[PDB]
A paper describes a structure:
In addition, we elucidated NaDC1’s outward-facing conformation, encompassing apo, citrate-bound, and N-(p-amylcinnamoyl) anthranilic acid (ACA) inhibitor–bound states. NaDC1, a representative member of SLC13 family, mediates both pH-independent, sodium-dependent cotransport of succinate and pH- and sodium-dependent cotransport of citrate within the kidney and small intestine. Citrate molecules are located in the interface of scaffold and core domain. (D) Key residues participating in citrate and sodium binding are from L5, L10, HPin, and HPout of NaDC1. Two bulks of ion densities can be determined in the cryo-EM map, locating in the Na1 and Na2 sites of NaDC1. Na1’s coordination involves the carbonyl oxygen atoms of Ser136 and Ile139, along with the side chain of Asn141 from HPin, and the carbonyl oxygen atoms of Gly239 on L5. Similarly, Na2’s coordination entails the carbonyl oxygen atoms of Thr471 and Thr474, alongside the side chain of Asn476 from HPout, and the carbonyl oxygen atoms of Ala518 on L10. To examine the transport activity, mutations were introduced in NaDC1 by replacing each of these residues with Ala, including the Ser140Ala, Asn141Ala, Thr142Ala, and Asn476Ala. The Tm for WT-NaDC1 is 62.9° ± 0.3°C, while the Tm values are reduced to 57.1° ± 0.7°C for Ser140Ala mutant and 56.4° ± 0.3°C for Thr142Ala, respectively.
Residue numbers in the entry:
A (entry chain B), B (entry chain A): 1 to 164, 213 to 578
Write the structure that this text describes.
């Protein structure tokens, strides 16, 4: 009878976990190679994340058993890949956010934000996108996400509670903060790390170049690209999760103004009934401002920060990172009392006073920390390390070489598509470092100017929108549990193509004059050209 | 008035955190050196752990801010020290223990253990010590602790609930399991990792030695040492936490037999009212047996395991570790259903069936995992790495050289005291690797036989009993929150001296005949001797 078909549909995750590793076994069986053994693991983890047949942190533990059991890397070497400085930065940022939420400062910030920008979905999403992109121009993307994801969560909670469809707004705001942190970092030379890697490669492979890639020329090239890509991402996320209406999205017309003025006066009254700030709110607000100001001035690149003055290494770089500052502020939050004269009496011995708790105690942290996101970030780093140790990146980099029998405006588009597809599985810095010296020689072989193929390769590494392991902002937005990986993939599949087309617009207009991409200059000559 | 003296005593942890870093500042100020900068951090973390002015995982985060801020190591290099394979082994073992506790198998195991060995404190502690030492002779110490600490916790909970002073029994059982895992590993050549390091050094520094250190001679030397040290540790932990009575400790005499027979019949009835095993209990019991059998036969050393047959490296060693097996079994626990035909109906849509949950879901794991012990183990590894990168181990190793103007039975005692003191701060393998080639040349300089100074150095690295970062068993016993670090230090300070005296007994009787430690053989000759 038909009662077996519901039993087969209820058990669908067990069937996925049993049948997906069997159906992909022809790839390691028919092609015995470490590149195929790593491609099997990448396809398996992507299929287990998009279907969510297992929890996210459980799928993130799969390199630890997969890579030693096919000879890619040792268990000792895959074990120290799961906790880097970018993961400690997330730990310290969320350690500050837990103290913000515990002492009701998140309600103050959310009510003041909703009092300033109002209650309209698309202008509020646009304001969050613009602020996240401007912050990501100057600090790290991970620091921007770890600062901005709980603020958007609190604003969204207060917006829900003032109106008593919201489950699409909670996806649109999370994905817009996630994508704005990645988009805004490409506009400056110090915004994302591969932007510096390109300058290191241009200085090493081509001396006598005369500092062709600096702060001013990179800004003049990559700021309109960032603005156009951010506005198109706003329009696409507004179309996909909200409607095609554009008057309901902007709150235009009556039967919409009435509910919006009612929600605005409800927000006004519940903000008025908060009172003065307590001692803990003032202390946490001062520490938050100090943390963001220390993140700004640590290593700016266009002037000399406190990380270069105090604590330099032999190369002059800072030995202290952003995660060090985050862990420092989070440790200080355990030491400052929550009330200063707060000497109470304990339920034990009746001759004792009692010191207050700190701004953080350990049991609040243990109840509130997303440890699955720590494990997800670590599993992403381990999969990215296994892709370099197996030889996938060297194999796919050497497939870009026979593209020489293609006209030059199409080489950049095909290369940008390939790099934007491959950067979902790997690291941005490693992909840039491996892929740039191949493209430099490929451009020297056909007498094409470098940075016609090196600038789209550097920009396409940042177009990482589909998988949780593509960028650390892609994993940080799963901290509250309302998102699915299928929503992120469905939103990012078109954003990759839109970003590739925006890079192709930027390299063929206003990138040709300010870089002289039609001349093949004399600093790119060698013994193989002529 | 006198009401200020209670306000000063209530605020004692804040005063410790403020005044201890200021009072130790003459050590980095008067002695500017990286060895002093690391000694400052070690003394500060030991003082913050023994007083517990901060939580344990918060004090374990101190290398991340300390080592880049005095130039010892970079933030990127100290960040990848916090999650090794021994930490993933604890994660996988406790991931199995959470599933044992969630499905009431821990009550079955605890009631059957209390039905077999009875209810008497000192014989039960001795049985746990003997089983933990015998298990630690053949598998890793971390695997033995991660298997045996929750079992002792469950037995202790059932023993408390059958008798309705226990707060001293819960310290004695935790510390006895912790110390038995460390003591039992010295008896075999494959029990602890420095035991193999010594054999590598004897083979590398002195060829033509004729395999003087093998399985049989190491067993014949180190098994009575282990037995004597285990019995003396049992007697000392019985004296320290229990009384000097030895008849109340063994339950001898009436007014003690009555309560013990009452507790035994209460245990009999509440074990009889459990019923047959469910599906989840049978599945978890089979997986537990399979996990311990895979831990036994992976890399035994005296025969060829499945880790050497399948998955070898170029040197023939196993690429798969014990943590890989633990993570493998813990991942399988998410896939097996808790009931097989358990198709229920969901509170949502009334046309759906519902698959059961697994033996593990993520929310039970998040509620039950001790993440502070993961951070504590990682902070210990980072402090141990900073001690090698700063140069403390090379500095303290070169202080063993001017001990040549001491008679030879006292050189071994002074060296064992120094190594047993220094191994509380550092790693056992690194201390052995650094300290053995200095002692070999020091013994060649005075025409003393090696292994008169290399065997006490190898054995004294395992006498690690005072600090949570000395051994991973020292950190695993804080998983349930009943212990203090001051109890561990108070119990281990005398056990270090007892172990040094037992090593001095073993090297001067029955170690002289079976190693010929009175002859200076011909394989230790060089160009500097004669
Ligand atoms: C160049 C200088 C740095 C510029 C940095 C980028 C620009 C940031 C502008 C953000 C403006 C957001 C609205 C107003 C400020 C935030 C709320 C606030 O001040 O709370 C006061 C609120 C108290 O207000 P009260 O109830 O009136 O006393 O809290 C505090 O005083 C302490 C807050 C410390 C941390 C502030 C974090 C603010 C994050 C805001 C994110 C906004 C995203 C969307 C913005 C759309 C703008 C178009
Ligand atoms: C050489 C072969 C391997 C030897 C390994 C080392 C020796 C281990 C002996 C441990 C004996 C402990 C008492 C009996 C076994 C535990 C309880 C049991 O059988 O549960 C059955 C109990 C069933 O109870 P029932 O159905 O109600 O009869 O559970 C199971 O069947 C599941 C078994 C899973 C694994 C259990 C591991 C228990 C470790 C206990 C450690 C005890 C420490 C103190 C022992 C002092 C001895 C002097
Ligand atoms: C951990 C739990 C959830 C089960 C996981 C099952 C699969 C996802 C994995 C785990 C072990 C894997 C196997 C481990 C080792 C091999 C040998 C490998 O062939 C070799 O010879 C590998 C070594 C080499 O030749 O270098 C082919 C893939 C295969 C069968 C792997 C196929 C995929 C398997 C079954
Ligand atoms: C963890 C947070 C909440 C509080 C930490 C306070 C102290 C435990 C630490 C943190 C910063 C440390 C300082 C960081 C750097 C230095 C410089 C150092 O002198 C140097 O010149 C170091 C660099 C070098 O010469 O190689 C002397 C120690 C001192 C003052 C350290 C003393 C101990 C301090 C105050
Ligand atoms: Na950035
Ligand atoms: Na990437
Ligand atoms: Na062992
Ligand atoms: Na140690």
């Amino acid at each position: 009878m038909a009662t077996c078909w519901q039993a087969l549909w209820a058990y669908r995750s067990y069937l996925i976990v049993f049948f997906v590793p069997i159906l992909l076994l022809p790839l390691p069986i028919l092609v015995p190679s470490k590149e195929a053994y790593c491609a099997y693991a990448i396809i398996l983890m992507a299929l287990f994340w998009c279907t969510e047949a297992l929890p996210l942190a459980v799928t993130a533990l799969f390199p630890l058993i997969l890579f030693p059991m096919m000879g890619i890397v040792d268990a000792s070497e895959v074990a120290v890949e799961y906790l880097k400085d970018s993961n400690l930065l997330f730990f310290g940022g969320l350690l500050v956010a837990i103290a913000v939420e515990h002492w009701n400062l998140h309600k103050r910030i959310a009510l003041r934000v909703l009092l300033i920008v109002g209650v309209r979905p698309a202008p509020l999403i646009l304001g969050f996108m613009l602020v996240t992109a401007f912050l990501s121009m100057w600090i790290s993307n991970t620091a921007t996400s770890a600062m901005m994801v709980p603020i958007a969560h609190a604003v969204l909670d207060q917006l829900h509670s003032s109106q008593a469809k919201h489950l699409h707004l909670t996806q649109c705001m999370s994905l817009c903060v996630c994508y704005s942190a990645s988009i805004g970092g490409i506009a400056t030379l110090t915004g994302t790390a591969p932007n510096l890697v390109l300058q290191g490669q241009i200085n090493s492979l081509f001396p006598q170049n005369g500092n062709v890639v600096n702060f001013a020329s990179w800004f003049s090239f990559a700021f309109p690209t960032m603005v156009i890509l951010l506005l198109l991402a706003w329009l696409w996320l507004q179309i996909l999760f909200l409607g095609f209406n554009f008057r309901k999205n902007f709150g235009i017309g009556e039967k919409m103004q009435e509910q919006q003025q009612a929600a605005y006066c409800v927000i006004q009254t519940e903000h008025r009934l908060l009172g003065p700030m307590t001692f803990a709110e003032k202390a946490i607000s001062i520490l938050f401002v100090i943390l963001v100001l220390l993140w700004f001035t640590r290593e700016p690149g266009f002037f000399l920060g406190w990380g270069n003055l105090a604590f330099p290494n032999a190369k002059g770089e800072s030995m202290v990172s952003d995660g060090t500052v985050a862990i420092f502020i989070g440790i200080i939050m355990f030491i400052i009392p929550s009330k200063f004269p707060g000497l109470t009496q304990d339920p034990e011995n009746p001759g004792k006073l009692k010191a207050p708790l700190g701004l953080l105690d350990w049991k609040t942290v243990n109840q509130k920390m997303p440890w699955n996101i720590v494990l997800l970030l670590g599993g992403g780093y381990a999969l990215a390390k296994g892709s370099e140790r197996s030889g996938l990146s060297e194999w796919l980099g050497n497939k870009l070489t026979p593209l020489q029998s293609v006209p030059a405006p199409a080489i950049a588009i095909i290369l940008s598509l390939l790099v934007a597809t491959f950067t979902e599985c790997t690291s941005n810095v490693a992909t840039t470092t491996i892929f740039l010296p191949i493209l430099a020689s490929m451009a020297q072989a056909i007498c094409l100017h470098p940075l016609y193929v090196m600038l789209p390769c550097t920009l396409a590494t940042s177009l990482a929108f589909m998988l949780p392991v593509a960028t650390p902002p892609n994993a940080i937005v799963f901290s509250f549990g309302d998102l699915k990986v299928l929503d992120m993939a469905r939103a990012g599949f078109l954003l990759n193509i839109i970003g590739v087309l925006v890079i192709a617009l930027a390299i063929n207009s206003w990138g040709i004059p300010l870089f002289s991409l039609h001349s093949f200059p004399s600093w790119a000559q060698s013994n193989t050209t002529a």
